[PDB]
Amino acid sequence: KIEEGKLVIWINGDKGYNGLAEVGKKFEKDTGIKVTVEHPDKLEEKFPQVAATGDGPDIIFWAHDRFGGYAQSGLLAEITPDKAFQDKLYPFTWDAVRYNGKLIAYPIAVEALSLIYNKDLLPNPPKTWEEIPALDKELKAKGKSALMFNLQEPYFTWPLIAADGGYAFKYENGKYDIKDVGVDNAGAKAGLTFLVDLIKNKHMNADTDYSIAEAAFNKGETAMTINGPWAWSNIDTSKVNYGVTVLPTFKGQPSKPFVGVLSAGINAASPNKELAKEFLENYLLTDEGLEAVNKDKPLGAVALKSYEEELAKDPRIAATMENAQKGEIMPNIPQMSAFWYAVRTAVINAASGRQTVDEALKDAQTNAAAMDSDPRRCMRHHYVDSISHPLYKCSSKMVLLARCEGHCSQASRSEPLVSFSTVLKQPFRSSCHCCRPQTSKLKALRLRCSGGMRLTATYRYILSCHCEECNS
């Protein structure tokens, strides 16, 4: 069940799905190819399952971090935009949609944390993190605070940490090196130490969360905060005259927030690859196409340079783009899942004073930084075999077994012994390690053999192997 000669697009409900259908109608009005946009619940769960069988949409809309997983399974098709079209979009957005060198989806929008400040309380925001401690003491005299944001989650605290040379995984050549984590190095060390200083200097509370963060700024009880475009709707309701600007510079360097990138990939199972490609390139990615989607619901920042320049007139969107360009693009590898608990554990322990800064980051380096296991070691190998007695014509049963096998890392040797009179010892004193069972348990099996008796067959099931001496 796959559509031929027509398009069907999937996009989340919170996106501008009515606005995309406007472009879908324009494609039908020109090409004579009808476009059906639809917004299922948990589409990111649905997409792997439907695409794996062969069904599913032609195009799929989701953040770039999820596409790395789909691309590995081979569910997305390889896109081919010429050099001319690649220049249309920003260079850094193309890096976000690239798996093993091959481009797998078209970028659309760009999401990133931005410094939101109170224009009334603070007409000119701080360019540097270092001057915030000084700013806070001045506002504490007026019964206010300088900065307040969600300290619990790493996503919000990371920009400060990654500023001086911290990183989750190294992205050096269109590939994320899993055994190259930069949470322990001096760059991330200094950022978190500065963050911890702010907490125990009573400029900030360790147990502040997203609820208290927003509630503080909306009531005008804090001059600044850090949050994405999504929370602008709430800030509008509070009637606090506010502005969005670039994040402050720690030790001269820029803060690196994690960057999401709303992308649009083509399904491999789709027969309408050419049709789908033109819809994204010619129809969607234009000042007319993106405006149609942005008018329904805002994309915020966009990949296309032409329309972005128009939208940047609104200083809020321009601030998001500036934080995105400077920011760290989020890893699309599935080993990123470990990053979240690791930093959230290290930050909370470092904030409360339960653990030091250097210890917490060293534990994060251990717990969530990728070691592979050796294939030729002495290990417990498993297999299936049908048990039957050799000289007895009757039935047999399928049973699980376990055997030891592998190359022991100890060197075998045999050096000659010296025997005197009345002391005739061995000719040689050898050492040799064999892969053998350390622990095992008994097994048995009654065998229903017709025309006879039901006799039992015993064997030892291996629980663990280890290299032990030959003579033992």
Binding site: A52, Y70, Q72, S73, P334, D372, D374, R377, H382, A402
Partner: protein, 118 residues
């Protein structure tokens, strides 16, 4: 239909090198399983149980053979031996034993009737 190779990194070197999806938790593809498996890395690195990694890999990317239809996971004997050691470590770091790793769902022993890995 025959079996597939193990595409996940951490669960490659085990007693086997062959697997069939969907797995025992409910994942239909291995890319999604790896996305959830890597959250167990602190418990593995901590080392409450030495068999933890094999137990997790037996569930999320189970053994399979083209001689039999059904896949091969761990037993209750393994599950209980791992849960005994690791639940106290989870509880002290603010976590409980998940429903996805319920030892009651797996069979008791590598029986003549059933079959699983110890």
């Amino acid at each position: 239909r025959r079996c597939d190779p193990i595409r996940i990194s951490m669960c490659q070197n085990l007693g086997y090198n062959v697997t069939k999806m969907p797995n025992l938790v409910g994942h239909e593809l291995q890319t999604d399983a790896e996305l959830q498996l890597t959250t167990f890395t602190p418990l593995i690195q901590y080392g409450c149980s030495s068999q933890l990694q094999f137990f997790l890999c037996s569930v999320y990317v189970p053994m399979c053979t083209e001689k039999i239809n059904i896949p091969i996971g761990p037993c209750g004997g393994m599950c209980l031996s791992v849960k005994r050691r690791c639940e106290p470590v989870l509880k002290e770091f603010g976590f409980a034993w998940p429903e996805s790793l319920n030892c009651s769902k797996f069979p008791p022993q590598n029986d003549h009737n059933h079959m699983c890995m110890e």
